[PDB]
Structure 1
Amino acid sequence: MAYNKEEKIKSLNRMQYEVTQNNGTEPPFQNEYWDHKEEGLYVDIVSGKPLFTSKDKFDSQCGWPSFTKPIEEEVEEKLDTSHGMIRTEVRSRTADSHLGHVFNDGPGPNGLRYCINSAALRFVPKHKLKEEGYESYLHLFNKLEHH
């Protein structure tokens, strides 16, 4: 039995779906291997799209990594109501809906609490980003606009 990056994402997206659908938590795995604190990004594995930086990462101390800073490019903040209370979730339309949930109780630029699940995440070091397209990744990890 072979195993390619296609079959990687296919088997993966079952578990990513388990999180999106039921708010399902990954089992005890999310440690120094999966979310390694070396400089880079934390991306939704389904697409490899930048959600938040390792430069400004918060660790899974509150169960899931919850920082004040999203990446405005591929992250959509989207209001909902389950039962009498409103909530906001960060969720794309097509595929990236696995990101996480954000709350107006957390202080931020807009005043949202950027809380992403570790199951949907892979650490991608600045070294590995250079292999995968640094001009897309490192631009969001580190930029400057000299006027």
Structure 2
Amino acid sequence: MAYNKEEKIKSLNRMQYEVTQNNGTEPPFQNEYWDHKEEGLYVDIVSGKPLFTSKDKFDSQCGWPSFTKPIEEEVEEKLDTSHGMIRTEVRSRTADSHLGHVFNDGPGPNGLRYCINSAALRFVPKHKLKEEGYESYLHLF
């Protein structure tokens, strides 16, 4: 009803909350996944649902995790006119946590650079996908 997600959120730490709940952003380079390259999945830190895979991730120099594309209708994009700018925010569909923004200067074909906060993700190694419950995606590798 209203105590699984509302509870998970309550158990988040300062930054994780600030980001996901207050749409803030973590420091560049001083986060956990910006340079991380282990094979695996990046799940919603709140709803636990798959958001990005280690395969679409790449090396940018912005200081935050960067992917070219997201996962199956699990990540939503929406206009963000806040802060006197005009950007495209990225949020998760199920847990509606702020993730970050998309930019059109990526390396992929479509040229998208999904710039996400480490603080909104729980990384799950490939050798643990089946245990955690992500056998359904174990093929994406």
Identity rate, percent: 100
Distance 1:5 1:23 in 2: 17
Q: 1:33-78 deviations in whole A, cap 9, x for unaligned? A: 9975321111221122222111332257421112212213311121
Deviates further, 12-21 or 26-35: 26-35
Give unpaired runs (5+ residues) of structure 2: none
**Alignment-derived partner of residue 144 in structure 1:** none
Deviation at 1:26, TM superposition (A): 4.2
TM-score (norm 2): 0.70
Relative distance call for 1:29 and 1:128 in structure 2 (3 A) is: farther
Query: What is the number of equivalent residue pairs in this alignment?
Result: 141
2:13 is paired with a residue whose SS is helix
Structure number with bigger Rg:
1
Contact 1:34 1:123 in 2 (8 A): no
2:36 is paired with a residue whose SS is coil
Distance 2:107 2:2 in 1: 47
Contact 1:35 1:42 in 2 (8 A): no
Relative distance call for 1:111 and 1:135 in structure 2 (3 A) is: same
What value does the CA root-mean-square deviation take over the aligned residues? 4.8
1:41 is paired with a residue whose SS is strand
Give unpaired runs (5+ residues) of structure 1: 142-147
Distance 1:114 1:26 in 2: 15
1:76 is paired with a residue whose SS is strand
Contact 1:16 1:98 in 2 (8 A): no
